[PDB]
């Protein structure tokens, strides 16, 4: 019963704050150019102890053949997909807290569930973008981001499962 609400909320704040922290730092920890870490925006050294704007997607030594550097490198730049996960998750918790009251038996829970799982898809796809463009160790809050996507996925499972539960109550009492 209410276990759906519990797992739902703890998934919301869990994967949400986890995605935020993932945006914060600890996304890639390795030797810099000398070792440092970076979170896809600006790297911070151990001179040592300061930071620098590191998401310089263009670098002044290349060839840039045809839509490879521009399109892909730009896509990885500004971290669009993970921000898409941010907005979509925001719609997740917001629309579930909306599903608290204002009954609307069928549409809302299913909707937020859909945009929520697909939000997870945006998260994983974004991770793919990041690991891709980066071409040695990873940051820990990176694992926090992936784990956030996972817990999100399970939360969506419980979501849709609760939705079809409501369908079972309605069609059940229909006879």
């Amino acid at each position: 019963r209410g276990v759906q609400m519990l797992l739902t909320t703890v998934g919301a704040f869990a994967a949400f704050s986890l995605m935020t922290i993932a945006v914060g730092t600890d996304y890639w920890l390795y030797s810099r150019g000398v070792m440092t870490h970076s979170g896809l925006w600006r790297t911070c050294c151990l001179f040592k102890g300061l930071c620098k704007q590191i998401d310089h997607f263009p670098e002044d030594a290349d060839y840039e053949a045809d839509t490879a550097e521009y399109f892909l490198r730009a896509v990885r730049a500004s971290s669009i997909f993970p921000i898409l996960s941010v907005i979509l998750l925001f719609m997740g918790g917001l629309c579930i807290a909306a599903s608290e009251f204002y009954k609307t038996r069928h549409n809302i829970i299913l909707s937020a569930g859909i945009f929520f799982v697909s939000a997870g898809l945006s998260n994983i796809i974004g991770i793919i973008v990041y690991i891709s463009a980066n071409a040695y160790s990873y940051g820990w809050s990176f694992y926090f981001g992936a784990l956030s996507f996972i817990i999100a996925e399970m939360v969506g499972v419980l979501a849709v499962h609760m939705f079809i539960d409501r369908h079972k109550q309605l069609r059940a009492t229909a006879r």
């Binding site: 569930g113 799982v117 690991i131 996507f149 996972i150 849709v160 079809i164 069609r171």
Partner: protein, 279 residues
Amino acid sequence: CVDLAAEIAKHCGFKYKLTIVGDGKYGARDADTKIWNGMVGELVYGKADIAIAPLTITLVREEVIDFSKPFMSLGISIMIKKPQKSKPGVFSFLDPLAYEIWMCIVFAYIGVSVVLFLVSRFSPESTNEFGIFNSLWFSLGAFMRQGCDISPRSLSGRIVGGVWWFFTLIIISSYTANLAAFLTVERMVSPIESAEDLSKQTEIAYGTLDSGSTKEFFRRSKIAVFDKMWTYMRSAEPSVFVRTTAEGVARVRKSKGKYAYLLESTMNEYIEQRKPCDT
């Protein structure tokens, strides 16, 4: 040489004495002076009675003293450093692609599974993928070559799973491919291992010991490749020559693979059988 000399005194019946030469050198004729140093300085200048030591016999050395029949035949040998790659255990399995790749594979795995389940439960009487567990199971069994057990009927299920085969083909076939070409070449090829190869490179330095018959050989060589080798060694910076053999040992050991050492087969194979077994 201790045991050998002992046997020689046994078969010759006399008293002897073990004496190390002061400079610790083979012996070489100082140019412009006609002066021999080292053990050659010992016998040539009447200071020693006989030499029983790892002494190379050359014509110029014959030209001043006498020699017996050689007891151990040998030749020039090349010493370098060696990379020691341990044969991995469990990791030998997941070797070919990458671990992060596998993590992404898990990602798309659980993702596809979930989405398919949404294809099942939505749109209300029940179908076969009505449960998450069976759908996940389908994803596994499709990922492997194991067979299907529950064919998705919905057009959306069929298309998603279709994409999922369009994935399993490339990913798994690729695995068998790189593993195939990976376990078919086990002969670890070295970076560079030859003399002419050292002549055709400039990254790894190489030199010999001073006051040694080796340096004489190279200076008297007429081989084009060897002439060039001498030409580089004689003027390379800093001096490619050392004072002791162990100096060359620790020199190559501490050269990070950037300095090769020339020396006869005997010492080379001997040190090669010694700890830390690194050359």
